[PDB]
């Protein structure tokens, strides 16, 4: 796999992890 | 890391990410 | 071919999981203030 893909994966991971953490949190606020 | 291996890591990690968030909030409201 | 070391890969995955815990904790702690 290419470093270009991996750059997307790593940064994507950071972003999605924050979004998931916050989505799950506010789901629990319903 | 092959594309197949990377794909398994992406999927497994995101499932686990959702559950970890869920678990932290669950424990936190006990 | 740039073969990645299994030790590094294992380390980074665990690293991600620990960071994930930390992110969830941060949300939790700041959320309840
Ligand atoms: C679909 C439900 C998945 C729930 C599983 C929880 C695993 C949690 C581990 C995550 C770290 C990343 C490793 C993920 C490894 C699991 C998936 C897998 O083995 O992938 C096979 C891949 O196609 C060839 O490596
Ligand atoms: C094959 C691999 C299978 C993958 C599975 C590995 C799961 C590992 C544990 C994750 C912590 C999640 C614990 C679940 C927390 C329970 C919270 C709960 O039941 O309450 C629901 C909610 O909080 C009320 O709306
Ligand atoms: C992605 C999960 C982040 C884990 C955070 C754990 C705590 C910090 C320790 C190490 C972070 C650095 C390791 C991850 C970034 C290094 C690998 C990398 O940069 O991959 C890019 C590659 O060059 C292709 O573009
Ligand atoms: C919207 C896009 C969403 C994308 C979702 C991504 C989720 C990836 C899952 C776990 C992060 C761990 C990634 C581990 C693979 C990269 C680290 C790696 O193998 O790098 C070792 C190398 O030696 C250093 O450059
Ligand atoms: K993650």
Q: Compute the C-alpha angle B28/A27/C16, nearest 5°.
A: 65
B12 three-class SS: helix
Within 10 A of B4 (CB to CB), how many other CB atoms are there?
8
Chain mean position to CA C8: 13
Looking from the CA of residue B23, the nearest atom of ligand 2 is 15
Q: Which of A21, A19, A15 is nearest to B23 (CA)?
A: A21
Resolution expressed in Å = 1.8
C27 CB-near residues (< 8 Å, 6+ apart): A21, A22, A25, B21, B24, B25
C32 three-class SS: coil
Rounded to whole angstroms, the Cα distance separating B21 from A21 reads: 5
Chain B residue numbers with beta carbons less than 8 Å from the beta carbon of C27 are: 21, 24-25
Q: With contact defined as beta carbons under 8 Å apart, do C27 and A29 qualify?
A: no
Looking at all shown ligands, the one closest to residue B20's CA atom is: 2
Cα dihedral A25, A13, C17, C25 sign: negative
Distance C15 CA to ligand 3 centre (A): 8
Experimental technique behind these coordinates: X-ray
Distance of residue B8 Cα from the nearest chain A Cα, in angstroms: 13
List the beta strands (DSSP E) in A1-30: none
Domain limits, chain A: 1-30
């Amino acid at each position: 796999v290419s470093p270009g893909v991996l750059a997307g994966i790593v940064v994507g991971d950071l972003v999605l992890t924050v979004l998931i953490a916050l989505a799950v949190y506010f789901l629990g606020r319903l």
